[PDB]
């Protein structure tokens, strides 16, 4: 679902990126690719990245790192992010249309 | 700048995808990458992917497959979409927010 957060295994990937949050429309299930964007932890980046904090650690969304990917690579979907929609809903908003 | 339509020099994809739209608002141009969607021969596919219709071909805006890449990689600026930003927004809108 929309917001659902899963694990990352992609092994050259994983240690920065170590979860991807599906953004797409829960309308566009059929797809066989889903949008997603990779959060990193806080410790690691030393408006447009909202910082998320969860069970899994406190991170900032790289919304400018998000990518189109198989739903197939999606899975271990550890937490959603629902509730905090607006903010990397506004993230995405920023990224393409400024201010 | 925000619409501008890079010809694709990526062997593996250039086939398909000939063309990449630059998304990504300009006031994000600090960023080493860029937000693009490819354009693909409208023959090749058999609301939220718009028609183009330009001096290099008919195409479909494949919004789905919008990503990331370098900005290094972009070049060859044959032509801009800005005439077309309202449905080009609207699509990535629809990808994201749905009805």
């Known amino acids: 679902s929309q917001f659902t957060l899963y694990k990352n295994k992609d092994k050259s990937s994983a240690k920065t990126y ?19 964007i990779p959060l990193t932890p806080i410790e ?11 069970d899994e650690g406190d991170f900032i969304m790289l919304t400018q790192q998000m990518t189109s990917v198989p739903v197939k690579i999606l899975s271990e979907p ?12 506004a993230a995405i908003d920023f990224l393409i249309t400024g201010i």
């Open 18 to 36: 170590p979860y991807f949050v599906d953004v797409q429309s829960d309308l566009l299930d059929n797809l066989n690719t889903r949008l997603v």
């Open 44 to 54: 690691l980046l030393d408006h447009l990245c909202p910082t998320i904090h969860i």
């Open 78 to 89: 550890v937490n959603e992010l629902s509730t905090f929609r607006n903010e990397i809903i």
